[PDB]
Design a protein around this ligand. Structure first.
Ligand code: 1BD
Ligand code: 1BD
Lengths: 109, 115
């Protein structure tokens, strides 16, 4: 599992459950690559395989807007967007969500 | 000044000076049109990107060029940039401050919206 995403809710103090996440790879346009929804643990595994996940620029779009929308909280952002170059020389993208703010970090091991 | 950007550096505890910032607005075909751009000053602030007349309702993307920043300091960062996408002025005109806090493998962004 070369790419995992983990999403937390800073208002509720909980994982962010059932959040839609779309990954794109840069082709100079954006092409769909993977997607899924976070689990009960706020996690998204099995997006891609080592074979598929080659060097390149990737964008992870976290559909935070629909997440806040579904609990009746007014959100600011359309989404959280995390753009990074993946290089061969294992990635967890973690995001921490609030209605008017978000934080993201990469754990690369 | 309806749209301001402030950028801080979490490694050095200082404003993030001379950081490029590009703002785009979503167009009538779901593409991103260039809207405004500039560079942060000594205080890590970017003022004068737009005017209230130009800053109409829409979906805007503020892209902070964190990669050239970190490279100009001699550091290899993770992200290509920091991005913030949001709808503005949807219920009338507002004043927006977009603040970002930068680390080589992380960033945070927050929005302060005034009437
Ligand atoms: O799976 C993992 O590596 C750990 C998940 O936890 N993520 C935490 C986290 C993520 C983004 C911004 C701020 C934080 C925090 F520091 F505030 F908590
Ligand atoms: O100019 C403004 O509106 C506020 C400027 O300061 N920004 C602070 C800030 C921004 C993003 C994440 C975390 C923080 C922080 F609180 F942790 F430091």
């Amino acid at each position: 599992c070369p790419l995992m995403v983990k999403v937390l809710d800073a208002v509720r103090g909980s994982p962010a459950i059932n959040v839609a996440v779309h990954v794109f790879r840069k082709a100079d346009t954006w092409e769909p690559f993977a997607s899924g929804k976070t689990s009960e643990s706020g996690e998204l595994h099995g997006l891609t395989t080592e074979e598929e996940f080659v060097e390149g620029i990737y964008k992870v779009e976290i559909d935070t807007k629909s997440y806040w929308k579904a609990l009746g909280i007014s959100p600011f952002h359309e989404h959280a967007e995390v753009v990074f170059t993946a290089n061969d020389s294992r990635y967890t993208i973690a995001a921490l969500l609030s209605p008017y703010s978000y934080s993201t970090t990469a754990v690369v091991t």
